[PDB]
Design a protein around this nucleic acid. Structure first.
Lengths: 205, 37, 138, 167
RNA sequence: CCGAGCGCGGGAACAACCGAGACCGCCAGCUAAGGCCCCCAAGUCUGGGCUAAGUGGUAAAGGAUGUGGCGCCGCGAAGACA
RNA sequence: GGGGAGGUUUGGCACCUCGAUGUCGGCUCGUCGCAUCCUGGGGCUGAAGAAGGUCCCAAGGGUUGGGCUGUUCGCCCAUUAA
RNA sequence: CGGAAGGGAUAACCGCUGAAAGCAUCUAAGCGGGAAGCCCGCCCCAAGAUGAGGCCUCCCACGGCGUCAAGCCGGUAAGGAC
């Protein structure tokens, strides 16, 4: 029921314990509280967090510099963490000692048009024997004159990549609050240089 | 013998009821356990 | 002569209860009013049949065992995607949708019968937005 | 009905006596009314469903009166080995051959009472909680199974032949 | 009968099933079948009897302490039925 | 000895398609049925227990890899929760 | 890393009270337990949900024609575009 923003840093292997660890590190960044959300006036429960302060002339207009507390804008907008309500402060990492697995929600790298082969993982055919014609084709679809049609959501030759992906449950290896680091078990969607948020997971009760 | 399209009372201990909308055969003996199946 | 044609008369608003009423015969009248069929000023292609706001449809009655046994089905185009939700659970979660969709199968289907289903406002309360008149009926 | 103090109402009746208070929701298809001391069950006609209703009813408020006049007996017994019936805590803690003990709370209207960890009684001013709870305990531990072991209300341990039947 | 009446009303749709032999016009009434809550036009008409399963809204022998009226045949205030 | 269900077998009829409906097996993508192969809930037992037996309930998921044949099927091979 | 855990009514089945029917009976009104199934809770799309939602801030009132009642037009403001 917790959360904080961040950005993708490394992926390495810290020789913690005596076991190597593929470790995504995430610069969680000092993401300030701002325009809060209640269910009386909005209809849910969330908090707005802007990422990294880099904003002057090129920001312009409203600002929640207005809000009541300012801070201008980050450099790349703010996001809403559901079920969240701090206590009137800015937040970075400290709210998570190690031992606290969390889901990590981030954007995903884009593969443009994906061939059906490298999307839903198909065979394509034989490396000779038959015809070189198909070779890497999605085979056939539905039956003859009945169905009579094709299936809405049939695994097909289309797009794959520029998507939103939430990964689930990873041991928070350690927290560096002296800067802005949050190192957990390696995974995390997207490039080594794109936005990614942290949210507390669901396991026991 | 549960679940048979015919069900009955075999001895003078087996008596039929109605339960949930299906016809059931009782008898203290469960080896006669019958139901409208 | 030449049969008469009503001008843009006034869309009269109305109010009906909901409770103690059969699901069936309820909408029956209701609907038939969306059509100016109650009015001596009925014209097929013009839609001047009143507004029907309904109140407390959370407590509609129905005969049969219905309550549980009455199932409604929705089909999303994707295969295997026939959903059915009993009247039972349609009461617990968003209960208006059982009065709505009912009338919705009691009018014609030409574009207007739609625009006309719009000419009806269901709530499970009572309460509404007191817009104007809405003088009660029976 | 001397220790009684009844209260008629549309659906249910709201009855009081020396123990706790109890209520029996009766299908209002005849109306009962506190007359003199003992109540009357007068159906509005003579039909099947009616007959059922009136009789049922009679037994319902019957159990209602005798209940508040103290009628709580929920006897139970165990015939196993180390099958003990400890009463530790307010709870009933039993070990019936399962790999671990068992913990029963006394919810509303009910206490327990273990005269000895070999036989267990439950206190309750409610005929439902009687049969249902005692049942739930015997369902903690099945009876007999061919030979003899487990929990029983106070019934008969019918058997299935020992050193045979296993071809 | 369809064919040659794929011209009309019913039957949801529907060559031959019901009604029905279509010169034209009519913003005139009766009626056939089939209907009269609504899609849809007209009775949420009057009175009595049934059924509780969506039966109605499509199958059998065969099984049943389902329901409601009819007929018979011994038992009982000298006391039966459980 | 009786009565059904289903429409995958072998087939009866010759209504659509002869101014063309590319008839077997394998591949790739699947899907829908339940009369369930496994998994899950259980009743009956000639069910001590373990394992089994049959019958109820129940598609959510899963339903391997090689030899021999164009082979569907089928026998074998090592596995299998299957 | 994910399936899960856990919530709610249930299938077959097993229980309580309980008449109809002095008895008995899971049932007719009344409850409780109880499936990998069922609605969820996790993952994602998503207000073209023409029903087009809600939150937060940012913006000036004829400018010259339409005199009433809807607008027309050449340039601005927040912005947005090439």
């Amino acid at each position: 029921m917790k959360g904080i923003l961040g950005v993708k840093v490394g992926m390495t292997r810290i020789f913690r314990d005596d076991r190597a660890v593929p470790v995504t590190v995430i610069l969680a960044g000092p993401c300030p509280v701002v325009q809060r959300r209640t269910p009386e006036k909005d209809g849910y429960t969330a908090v707005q967090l802007g990422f990294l302060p880099q904003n002057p002339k090129r920001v312009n207009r409203p600002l929640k510099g207005h809000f009541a507390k300012a801070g201008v804008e980050p450099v790349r907008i703010l996001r809403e963490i559901r079920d969240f309500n701090p206590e009137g402060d800015t937040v970075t990492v400290e709210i998570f000692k190690p031992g606290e697995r969390v889901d990590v929600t981030g954007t995903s790298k884009g593969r443009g048009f994906a061939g059906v082969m490298k999307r839903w993982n198909f065979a394509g055919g034989p490396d000779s024997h038959g015809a070189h014609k198909i070779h890497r084709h999605p085979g056939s679809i539905g039956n003859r004159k009945t169905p009579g049609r094709v299936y809405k959501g049939k695994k097909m030759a289309g797009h794959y990549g520029a998507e939103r992906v939430t990964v689930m449950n990873l041991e928070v290896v350690d927290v560096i609050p002296e800067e802005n680091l949050l190192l957990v078990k390696g995974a995390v969607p997207g490039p080594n240089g794109g936005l990614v948020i942290v949210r507390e997971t669901k396991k026991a009760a | 013998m549960k679940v048979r399209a015919s069900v009955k009372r075999i001895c003078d201990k087996c008596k039929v009821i109605r339960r949930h909308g299906r016809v059931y055969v009782i008898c203290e003996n469960p080896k006669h356990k019958q139901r409208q199946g | 002569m030449k049969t008469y044609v009503p001008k843009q008369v006034e869309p009269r608003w109305v109010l009906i209860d909901a409770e103690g009423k059969t699901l069936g015969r309820l909408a029956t009248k209701i609907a038939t009013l969306l059509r100016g069929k109650h009015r001596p000023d009925w014209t097929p292609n013009v839609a001047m049949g009143d507004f029907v706001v309904v109140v407390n449809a959370d407590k509609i009655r129905v005969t049969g065992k219905k309550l549980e046994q009455k199932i409604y089905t929705r089909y999303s185009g994707y295969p295997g995607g026939l959903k059915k939700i009993p009247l039972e659970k349609m009461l617990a979660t968003h209960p208006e949708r059982v009065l709505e969709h009912a009338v919705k199968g009691m009018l014609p289907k030409g574009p207007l019968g739609r625009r006309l289903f719009k000419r009806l406002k269901v709530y499970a309360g009572p309460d509404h937005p007191h817009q104007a008149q809405r003088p009660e009926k029976l | 009905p001397k220790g009684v103090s009844v209260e008629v109402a549309p659906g249910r009746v709201k009855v009081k006596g020396p123990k706790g208070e109890l209520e029996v929701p009766v299908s209002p298809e005849m109306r009962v009314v506190v007359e003199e001391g003992v109540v009357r069950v007068e159906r509005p006609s003579d039909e099947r469903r009616h007959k059922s209703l009136h009789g049922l009813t009679r037994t319902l408020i019957a159990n209602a009166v005798k209940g508040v006049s103290e009628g709580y007996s929920k006897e139970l017994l165990i015939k196993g080995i180390g099958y003990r019936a400890r009463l530790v805590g307010r709870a009933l803690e039993l070990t019936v051959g399962f790999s671990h003990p068992v913990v029963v709370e006394p919810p509303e209207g009910i206490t327990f009472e273990v005269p000895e960890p070999t036989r267990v009684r439950v206190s309750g001013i409610d005929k439902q909680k009687v049969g249902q709870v005692a049942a739930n305990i015997r369902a903690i531990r099945k009876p007999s199974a061919y030979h003899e072991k487990g929990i029983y209300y106070a019934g008969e341990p019918v058997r299935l032949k020992p050193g045979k039947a296993g071809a």
